[PDB]
Write a structure and sequence with these properties.
The complex is a heterododecamer, with three copies of chain A, three copies of chain D (97 residues), three copies of chain G (124 residues) and three copies of chain J (105 residues). Chain D is mainly α and 97 residues long. Chain D has helices at residues 56-72, 82-94, and strands at 16-17, 42-43. Chain J has one domain: Immunoglobulins (Immunoglobulin-like, Sandwich). The chains are: A mainly beta (157), D mainly alpha (97), G mainly beta (124), J mainly beta (105). Chains A and E meet through strand 1, strand 2, strand 3, strand 5 and strand 11 of A and strand 2, helix 1, strand 5 and helix 2 of E. Strand 5 (65-67) of chain A pairs parallel with strand 5 (78-79) of chain E, so a sheet runs across the interface. Chains D, E, F: It is found in: Host cell membrane; Secreted; Virion membrane. Chains D, E, F: Disulfide bonds join 9-54. Chains D, E, F: Residues 13-93 form the Envelope glycoprotein GP2-like HR1-HR2 domain.
Amino acid sequence: SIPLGVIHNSTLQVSDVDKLVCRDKLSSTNQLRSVGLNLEGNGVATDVPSVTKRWGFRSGVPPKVVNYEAGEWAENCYNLEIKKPDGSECLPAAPDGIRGFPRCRYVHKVSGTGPCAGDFAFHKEGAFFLYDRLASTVIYRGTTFAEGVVAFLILAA
Amino acid sequence: SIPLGVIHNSTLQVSDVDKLVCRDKLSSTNQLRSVGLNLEGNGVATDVPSVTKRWGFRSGVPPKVVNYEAGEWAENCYNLEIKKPDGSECLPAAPDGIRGFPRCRYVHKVSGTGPCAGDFAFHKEGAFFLYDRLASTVIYRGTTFAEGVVAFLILAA
Amino acid sequence: SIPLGVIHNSTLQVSDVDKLVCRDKLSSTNQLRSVGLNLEGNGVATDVPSVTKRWGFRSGVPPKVVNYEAGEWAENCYNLEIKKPDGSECLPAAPDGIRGFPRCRYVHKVSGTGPCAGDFAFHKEGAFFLYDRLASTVIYRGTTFAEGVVAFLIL
Amino acid sequence: VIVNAQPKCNPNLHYWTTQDEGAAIGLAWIPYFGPAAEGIYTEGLMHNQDGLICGLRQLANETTQALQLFLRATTELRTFSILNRKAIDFLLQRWAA
Amino acid sequence: VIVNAQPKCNPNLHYWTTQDEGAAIGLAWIPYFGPAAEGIYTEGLMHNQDGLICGLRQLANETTQALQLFLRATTELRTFSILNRKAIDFLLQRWAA
Amino acid sequence: VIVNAQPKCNPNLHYWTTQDEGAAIGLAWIPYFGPAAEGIYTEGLMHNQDGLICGLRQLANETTQALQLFLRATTELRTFSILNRKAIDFLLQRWAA
Amino acid sequence: EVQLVESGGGLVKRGGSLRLSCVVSGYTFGGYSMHWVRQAPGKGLEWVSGISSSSYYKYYADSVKGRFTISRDNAKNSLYLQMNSLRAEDTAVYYCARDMGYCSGGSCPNFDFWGQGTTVTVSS
Amino acid sequence: EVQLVESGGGLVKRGGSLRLSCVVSGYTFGGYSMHWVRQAPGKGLEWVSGISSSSYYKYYADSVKGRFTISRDNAKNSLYLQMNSLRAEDTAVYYCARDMGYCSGGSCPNFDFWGQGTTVTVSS
Amino acid sequence: EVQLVESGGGLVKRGGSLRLSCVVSGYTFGGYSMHWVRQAPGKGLEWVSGISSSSYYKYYADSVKGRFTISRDNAKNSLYLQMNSLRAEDTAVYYCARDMGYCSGGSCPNFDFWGQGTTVTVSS
Amino acid sequence: IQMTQSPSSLSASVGDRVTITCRTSQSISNYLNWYQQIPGKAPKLLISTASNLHSGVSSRFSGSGSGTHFTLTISSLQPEDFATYYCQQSYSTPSFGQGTKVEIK
Amino acid sequence: IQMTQSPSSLSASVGDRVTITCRTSQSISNYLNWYQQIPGKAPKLLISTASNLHSGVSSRFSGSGSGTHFTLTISSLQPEDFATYYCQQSYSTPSFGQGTKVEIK
Amino acid sequence: IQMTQSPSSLSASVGDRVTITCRTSQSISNYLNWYQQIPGKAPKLLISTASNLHSGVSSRFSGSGSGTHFTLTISSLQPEDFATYYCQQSYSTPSFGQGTKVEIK
């Protein structure tokens, strides 16, 4: 049930499958595009104690990932590393092919303890964590990420 | 060389893969379906000593897996755990993404030693072991499975 | 921007993407083929000291692989095992689904010690190492490979 | 066209699936507030429409051999693209030349 | 038809990508002589043209829920085929008569 | 249009493939009874018909650079979908819009 | 000032159908989702259905599923509800309401501005 | 009772062609696979070919490959074999046989029901 | 003996257009890549552009990017260059050169055969 | 989910304190809203998320609670504050309350 | 796969046991069938799977063996049991034997 | 990449040995070529890859070097060895040199 939006004359219009005029032209597979945007461009706060409040631990769901093509310059980035009080780790190691965010000016690194209840950390709002051309639903250890969402578009003819 | 059966009011016609005869409309990717059916529904005996005879070890062939969409409620399920006389294991660990069958009432668990001559366990009749939306050709240790076959259809809607 | 060549009347012609030709007939997905060809069919020297010169170590780039359908009979094959002077292995272990070249007569197996400066071994020319139906970019330890290139065709 | 030939064929189909749920109300779609691993399945029941359920228990049996041969001639570990290829060939057969 | 409803929207987009470069001159395309992992990106900058960026942010914020619902109903680990499937259905819709 | 420029070109082609084998008789198709890992290949031989083989070698040598550049700008670890993509764009060029 | 005006209520025969409209002036209609609420004579409040900003998500209640249809129009600032197969329990006073969008499509409504309401009754 | 009847045999010249038919009555023809066998005068029995239940798999013999063609018809309960480019060795008596389906496509036959056979002679 | 002959050069007005041709005879045309070089009234040398054997890859220089066009034809062994929007700095002597193919598309030029060079003049 | 309110009805005089409760059959964190309706008038919004006062509403009203216990409080009566109160949830499918009417002695 | 039978011919009287053997050039587990043909008539099935009696055949016949050695046995001869006997395999492409005949003395 | 070859003008008598240098601002391994031009004639090729002489050229010319430092050398002047020289690189986008002239005394 994925919606897509077409762009024409600098005008954006969200269209479904049956609403598709004959004017619409797709002559290559390079017109389809995917772009990931950040949340700090909407006015959301960026302070450290004002964003750790939206991540919570659960156990019982498996994670999933999708892929990216483009990005956007970021002002703030995050890099967490959390341990249990007894000395255990709370976050999973990164798999093969996962790398940090390419372009952002600041990076806030945090190391400390915490009451890890579940197994995976999710976002209480339904958004994504952004890595190098891969957008996930959970948090991997020691990899710089951003916070944002994804969009699918058909580019101008 | 996979054959598919099309459904109209004359039931399952296996008409040639050349989807000809004019009045045959396909309009979306949701009309294509894959379903797995169990062997116990054909009258096959389901007792423990009467199914263990169709599983045999070999070495020299690698395994393969395919995917499912739908299923069918089962009455009996199996959960094997086999060891060699010296104390070593006989079956491989499950890969990531493999989970047991969702819905069956009875589960027989079997643990004992035996002469593991080969490396992998195969079926002497060409049938599939069934897991959660994935169908394999070998047996993974400590995972509940069923026995069945796979069919590919296109719906009438 | 991958080019492909069409065959007609025993003539190989490189079709242009910009120009569309109505003479092309594609009626199934079995007419698309990928073939791997060897470098030793072009007169390149195959002796051992004359081929260890074109493989060089670097660190900072990740590897990538492609897949094959067809092959070619070979006469010379290589199988490397190199260790650091302190005894550390210079080459990674093979992944799952990787097997050696099936059909080749001679096998030059070489074991020794060298100055492994980098992390992955690359070809100084831009050609591929050939395995069992998978064309890689780096060298895996203990697997027999050939040297060659890849082409795509419409039959 | 298909005639069943097993000693017994069950005429009742009790199945399960997952579906897509289209749109959801409440906080259910968020993975933090959603169901567990089991609880995403939707059930049903179907009766033996004339020569349909049992005539469908043979079409599977006939298929397996061909499928197995296909799986021998490939290098992938998991396959997800059989139906996409079927659609591509269906599109290529009629729409070409 | 998309009207932004966020408290603010930044009207300037500073973006990066990879592209393909088509042809290269020198020893640049050889992995032994080419760049490192960082150095393959091409940058740009765009200004607001009739609220394009704010509408873009609104569109992403609307899409998130359907994206999550689609992702819940698969067994894979990484997904690369959403656009190819979109093309397949876009082609299948019209070619039936 | 292709003219070879190598010092030599062997005009003999000796290849190996796997094919499909369509149907089988006996207990061969069952993986419990069938061949080992080596034994699934079919050989052959072709002769130089108007310099097909040397032109083929030239075509591979010309393809390598664009292939490397394409491989640079992707995220996957193994690639299998080049030919399906080529089919999709070939179908999109003529029959679309 | 947020102003909402309802229209379409009245008296109908059993087994019939009806259409209600809600018109809003004061702000940007195209950035918010809308919902419908009802109250029977001397009874409590009940939720009927709701829509989204791009007309991509529609919701319905079990008691009216398969009988009611919702729609909206951003250009003319209008909201429409169509009712079919009218029963005895469908005599009430109806309101159109707006919410603060804490969710992605209108999943978690928090009504902040209400209308006036219209009366619909069906009987002999 | 299971009844299989063969027909089509006769006398033909060198380089000609022929068509043999086998007709079965007594059970459901649509769930089983057929096979052909032959025996030359004073010699032993030789397997030739067979078909599957849905006409999807076909098998041929090396001594015959490229010359014969087998087909079936479920509606009329009929089996047909077409023989082309007949050498002098192809003079024999032919039987059509039914097998028990222990395998998926008819690749491991165990004949249980036979017919009567028909005689074909080729000479000047 | 390899023979390379240039033609087309001369005198043009400001802002005009020009076209040049290079003809090669003595060996196989279609197996090699070609390039253009130019020299000033008495300073060093500079590289302009180059093409490939199959006409798949093209290269251009920054100082002429967006103004020139290069092409080749293997049928009559010809190399063509088209220049537009001419300025005062394009008065020089031009050469067409051949290189040995050490790189896949013709990206590593080691010139080994030169022509004789034609003259281009543009002024009031 | 079932909604419970107590006391159902009440009569009070000017200058007292009014404390009301709302109850549910599940644990829904803090997704609760309170509404007030005057007879003959449309409902009006009040404190949201069980403690977030709206804009233009007098500070006398105050709500609190979480989990399965939620309490609303009015500190000083006023002559125009004699009307009905409702609670509504949004964790799952919407469902209003039963009502509560305050009166005079 | 080559088939060998022994003895090729034999003659005996009513009341005597008969034993016949079939041998192969490979290992085919237990996929062997036995057949009997009387002159002037089409063949008829006998024990299957190399140990499984058919339905409608007298209990006198019995076969056994495995691997590369298979045997058929008649316990008591009857005046109408003078025919020719065949062994067949189905592990690979099918192939019958050459034959074996029983007569009277 | 920019080059620096010097001296720009030299004069020596017949029987002398002339050594010239070409320098670069980057490391280009050994992708360097040398050229010679008679005034009024198109340039002609010389040693390649910093050590590989062409075909048909005299053995009097010899060049060497690596990295950033490369030197060309001639052992015996001739009456027909008065011309202009150039050095060129191909590691990246091509770029020539400035020139060096040999004269007579």
